[model samples]
Target chain A: SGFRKMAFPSGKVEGCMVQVTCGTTTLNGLWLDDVVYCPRHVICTSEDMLNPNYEDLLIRKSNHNFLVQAGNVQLRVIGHSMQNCVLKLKVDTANPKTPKYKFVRIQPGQTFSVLACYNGSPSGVYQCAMRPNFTIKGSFLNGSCGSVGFNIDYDCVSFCYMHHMELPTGVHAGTDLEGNFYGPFVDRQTAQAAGTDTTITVNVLAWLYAAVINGDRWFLNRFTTTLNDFNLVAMKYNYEPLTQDHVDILGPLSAQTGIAVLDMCASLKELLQNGMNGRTILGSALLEDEFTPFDVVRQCSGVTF
Target chain B: SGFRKMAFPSGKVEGCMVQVTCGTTTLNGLWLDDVVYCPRHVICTSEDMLNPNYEDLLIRKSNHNFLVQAGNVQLRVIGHSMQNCVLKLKVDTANPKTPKYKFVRIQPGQTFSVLACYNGSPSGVYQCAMRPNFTIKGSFLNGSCGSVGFNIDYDCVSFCYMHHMELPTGVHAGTDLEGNFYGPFVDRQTAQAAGTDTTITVNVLAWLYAAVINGDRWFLNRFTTTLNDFNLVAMKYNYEPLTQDHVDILGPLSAQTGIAVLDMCASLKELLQNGMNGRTILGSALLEDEFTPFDVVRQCSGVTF
Candidate 1:
């Protein structure tokens, strides 16, 4: 219990914000921890475009996970940072004792790897292989530290916190298919809060992740308001089209097999009804010397860590 | 008599093809008449976009009108001229006995005048006064020969033939309001071919004319498929905004009183149910020494020639 050792650094990352709520106190500003954590809300402002700053609305860190003590905590994205805004998610490494968090922009079609468990040779890290006909699962580890990688299952908790903002109605000329939060598909109240079960949260993460990898702006626009401007940046990022392998991992129930047929509403409705079949949406190969808690495959589907 | 003097010219206008059916024989070629006649169909091939030719699908010149012998002689526009394609309608003058047909291209938001009837003074010529809030009516004759004046009622017969093409299904997200060929509103069969009754033709002409005057491309796109490319060219042409006076002449029944609410289907259906009310869509003040046949105001509505 080194409570006195806790220190807040003077420096902060740009375009990052968080909410911290402890006891009855609630503060919204930058959380300057040595290791960056996910924010409950991402606020973009005109000033943010130039003098970028982080927000700390609620922040709590523990050995297992980041927690928010607020009674009602949810992500609500508001404002525009002229399109070049991003919410950085925490990436876990092989060593929990000395975990290294990578800070790099995620690009479409690029391989993203994450260590399922610690290994001496670095062979335990699994990478998402997005090919022409790629599946949602990861391939054999090449044992490289250069290829950007993140554990889909362990990182779902962090990614879900950023993307699951409140969606508006009448976005386009179509019937509003309300949320399908029933049965095993738990609502945000259970999935978002610090809980043991993260079945729905992982699935939501997979759906969004798949869309981002495929560079499906049409589908992404439904979730984010900065699409028009974000597309300009994405176009320069060199994207790879979705392949058959990508479809197989998403499960047979997934209807979004191609970019042309990327209907966000239809795909979301389908996922809510079917869940993620038996197979994980972004499942990777089993790693040797798999550790508990961090090794998502051993604890749960490669979706939850 | 001028009848004997009537001679077909050896030289023909390029892209001008007419469908002339003398009894059972139907010939499609250049009409070569000294005065250009309206065609039943305007065809634009990939070649026409460059060659820039006129079509003479059907042609017949008389003391009173340019007649088409074809039984079902309706205008059907098919193909593209790379956005520069134009359908030139015959323009009348103070001297119907010696009509002068000008062949200048029509620009959006530009004043177009037509001689309502022949007058010794060019002061008889009436021009379409298009200003902000300008009504679908003509202003008093400034008497200039250069200001384009078209008898809204008289030239409607010629203009209607070129624009009244078959509308396709599911062009955009909207219900198909079939058509309003009821009451005094006649179908293409009655309105297209030569006929004494042109009540509906003149009204249709006014509705289309008003949309063109206001540069309402959204409303025009429904009637023509060449809108995407045509808009490129129209952008270069300076256009004036619609004014209040333009709304008055279209009558209260017209739903499309301005460019913003330019709904083609809704406006047409409304016109069918309630004719042009009492006021003509494009009417002008009386002129001295107004000719009988050419004077649209005295004969019928300004919409019919």
Candidate 2:
């Protein structure tokens, strides 16, 4: 299959405002909405830097609010007058059947950070708008008159996916970092020195697992051992050891049989590594076993591995 | 009576070709008439940087030239390609009685200079038009044809020579290295030392004579000694000097005995210096006297004061 590519248009958004500082002196009732153009897209509407979502649907009267999508989006806000000025945001999900637009509100002066995602289904134009709530147009200008405004636009579309299918088998072992093994494996101490040697080797039985096992290629390639040209086997089934914290939970079962523990550890490690790299992993037959906590194994192993 | 100023609109002429060459190769051929808006008031023309005449008129072919009377005008012909271009000026005096329209050709590669002079006149507009010689047009890709075609816009006029009576003097002694005189003529001795001192005294006497004999107020000034002043009583009229050279030509005369040859020599020296400075010594009485030649005195008064 041929490779497909997608195009993304980067945009720049700018906002203008008049900031007024509040003091003991009698403050003038300001009307800001009169002149400033309330733009459709709010570049900034939240305080959360890590995860910021745009306001769903609500518009601002004299106050300022911006609508945005959920995820990692950069936000920047500017105000004409800083005094007594309030910036707010709300989500609008017109279609109830559809997921309610989730949002993270950034306080005034805070940056909005979140990612914008698309299902890649339909391609169409989307408008982001802003509303400035103010009573009098020129009141904010202290009697001056002119037009102030803002705007936003975007588009999204879809594509296809590809996959790879092939395999090789062999029994390879080494005491160096680049070692591999295959066969009915013995204990870690018998197979290779783990603590003393700069590197170690472990046996992996191929027939014990199916071709559809989920894990990162890096972890699989690191421990899996090929035996012959046609047939292969996973000798040390579940004797793989993990870090001290992980060992405390799985150690009892693993100690009873080194092969069982090793097998479980290798699979868990691969799942965790793949998740961190943002690669999708399918559940393996081993995960269906009632004795195994797949969710816990997936999370802890993915993060650390 | 208040001075009544006069103004004359500069007449325009066009349709002449200026060819520039270097050694033997023809570098460029431009029409001076078109360059200066020959048929109309002001026309657009491109400039060559290498042969710039800040005073040279510029026309962009698409825009009108704006000119104001009494305003400083510069003609610059700059551009590497224009270095060898000949500047041919064909002027149409408009009035046949004044002079027939003539062509003044400046040799190839030579710089042409022009100054605009106006006699005070009321505000008015004029145009300098030129004959059309060439047309150029172009377009873009894919588009049906967005063309920029050139043509002689004879009806299109360039704003020229707007006159005003209140305009300040636009011409003055230029400070360029070749045009001005620098001096410190504080006292008679200083002037004498500089060779112009005797000329100054002669000029003063000439002025007095003109004021008293010709009744010309232009020649009278508070700086000159009055002929009727009490301090002038002791002064006596003296015989003009006659040199041996004069004797050789017209025979020795009886009225030549009292003349001071040294004073006459000093006066001649002053006159020569003033001529170099672009000044004229005027007075009929000064011109009436015959004087000895300083060359003759220099030869006759050998080894003596």
* Docking quality (DockQ) of candidate 2: 0.00
- For model 1, how does the per-residue alpha-carbon lDDT over A148-244 read when each residue is reduced to its tens digit? 1332321131111111121111000100012111112121222222112112222233444443332333323333223233333323332222333
Question: What interface Cα RMSD is found for model 1?
Answer: 42.4
| Over 4 Å off, model 1 | A1-305, B1-48, B52-305
**Weakest 10 consecutive residues, lDDT, candidate 1 chain B?**
B1-10
**Cα error of candidate 2 at position A26, Å:** 95
List chain A TM-scores, every candidate, in order. Answer: 0.20, 0.19
Assign candidate 2 its CAPRI class. Answer: incorrect
Model 1 agreement with the true structure over B1-305: per-residue lDDT tens digits: 00000001101111123333223323232222222232222332334333423333222322222222212433332211211122222322111222223333222232333321111111112223212221112211111101122222211211111111211110001000121111221112222221121122223334454433323333233332132333232233222222234334344324323322234333433444443443222221111011111212121222211
Clashes of 2: 110
- Per-residue lDDT tens digits for candidate 2, residues A176-269, read 0011111122112232221211100111122112112212233243353222211212122222322344335444334333434345445544
Error of 2 at A157 (Å): 87
